[PDB]
Amino acid sequence: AAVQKLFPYTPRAPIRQGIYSQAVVVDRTMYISGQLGLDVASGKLVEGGVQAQARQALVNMGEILKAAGCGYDNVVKTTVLLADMNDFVNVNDVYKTFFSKNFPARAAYQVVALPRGGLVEIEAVAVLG
Amino acid sequence: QKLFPYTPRAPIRQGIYSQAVVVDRTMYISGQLGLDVASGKLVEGGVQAQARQALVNMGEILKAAGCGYDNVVKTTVLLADMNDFVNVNDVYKTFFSKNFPARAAYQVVALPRGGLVEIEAVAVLGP
Amino acid sequence: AAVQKLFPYTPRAPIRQGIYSQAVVVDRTMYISGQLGLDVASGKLVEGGVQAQARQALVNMGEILKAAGCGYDNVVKTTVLLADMNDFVNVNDVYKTFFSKNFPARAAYQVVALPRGGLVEIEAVAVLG
């Protein structure tokens, strides 16, 4: 038969309309698209560099979680894609203000480039309660 | 409750990975390259041709599990060059036209076989 | 409602306290953090290059699997992150010694840099029996 996919959407977080969904929920599992440090009000990356962008990516992720009836506690795995491996600690310090206990599994590493010239992209898997 | 669908119509690295693993209702699909099994080589024509062939390969694996593109819930698009982003998205959109997967996309240094694009995916089977 | 999350822990694999859990198990699915070729006893990457590091990364992953009551046969998907794509065969040659049949799905690619200067990092998803 068909598959019961859900597509929770919020205009408070970015999307590439017609290319990807902010998130897809199937039964208990929520796949969240890679989040960038974009401000939906401006359509541009926030200023201030990797720390500001990482914070805004996680703010964006939180709006998507909330649209599905979830919160940061629901995240079970993230991948932190960095423009510069040197930013590991500074990004971790931002990250821990969102995931402060019961931490997701994680991988973090430096890639060549991200969409929109971003300095960080964060994807996630969450599970519904 | 764990299946390993295989199709000779898509590539594999025998003894290294399965094309896909179906466990419960979730299907994990290996990173697909723009390889043509008939020639044993990457298709000619550049990143658009390779991205299309990768997605054709993914479709053959999906069909081997009784699925189609609608079952895909998440993909990761790995590019050799971020300058190919628009051209790859245009090909990508011809396979996923609504109810789109979640997605991550980024440029890496290099891919197996010298490919210009690799696409991995998670799909979910319907009841 | 809250989602029920379990965090396998082994003293035989690394952990970044306050940043990530070695793995998260939710409703039979286990997300394993990216593993480097780190020797917990020495606090350093092992001697011997990418093949020694890949072996240690997989040994570490196996100890985390054991903490969840799992083994290598429970792994359903891995991602192999390389410092150098020319190491592909060498890493495959170590990787295949840990799986004999019913192999995980896999993705592999060369990144710019990994934490600790590692030459290879392997993340995984597993499913409990």
Residue numbers in the entry:
A (entry chain B), C (entry chain C): 2 to 130
B (entry chain A): 5 to 131
Paper text:
The term Rid (reactive intermediate deaminase) refers to the hydrolytic deamination of highly reactive and labile enamines/imines to α-ketoacid and ammonia, a reaction that would be otherwise relatively slow if left to occur spontaneously. In the present study, we identified two functionally active RidA genes in the salmon genome, here named ridA-1 and ridA-2, and we performed an extensive biochemical and structural characterization of their products (SsRidA-1 and SsRidA-2). In order to better understand the structural bases of the observed differences in terms of protein stability and of enzymatic activity, the crystal structures of SsRidA-1 and SsRidA-2 were determined at 1.05 Å and at 1.36 Å resolutions, respectively. Monomeric SsRidA-1 and SsRidA-2 share the chorismate mutase-like fold common to all the members of the YjgF/YER057c/UK114 superfamily: monomers fold in a single compact domain of one six-stranded β-sheet packed against two α-helices.
The two SsRidA-2 trimers are virtually identical (r.m.s.d. values 0.45 Å/380 Cα) and also SsRidA-2 monomers are all well superposable (r.m.s.d. values in the 0.15–0.26 Å range over the whole Cα chain). However, SsRidA-2 is the only ortholog with a Pro residue in position 9 in place of Ile or Val in the other analysed sequences. Residue 9 is part of strand β1 and a substitution of Val or Ile, which are highly compatible with a β-structure, with Pro, a β-breaker, results in a shorter and less regular β1 strand in SsRidA-2 compared to SsRidA-1. In SsRidA-2 this intermolecular two-strand β-sheet is not present and both regions are partially disordered in the structure. Secondly, the shortening of β1strand by Pro9 reduces the H-bond network in the central β sheet likely decreasing the stability of the monomeric fold. Crucially, residues 16–18 are typically small and hydrophobic in RidA primary structures, while Arg and Gln are present in position 17 and 18, respectively, in SsRidA-2. This confers very different chemical properties to SsRidA-2 binding pocket compared to SsRidA-1. On the other hand, SsRidA-2 has a positive charge in position 17 and, under our experimental conditions, showed a strong preference for the IA derived from L-Glu, while the lack of activity on the IA derived from L-Asp cannot be explained. On the other hand, SsRidA-2 showed a more canonical denaturation curve revealing a Tm of 65 °C.
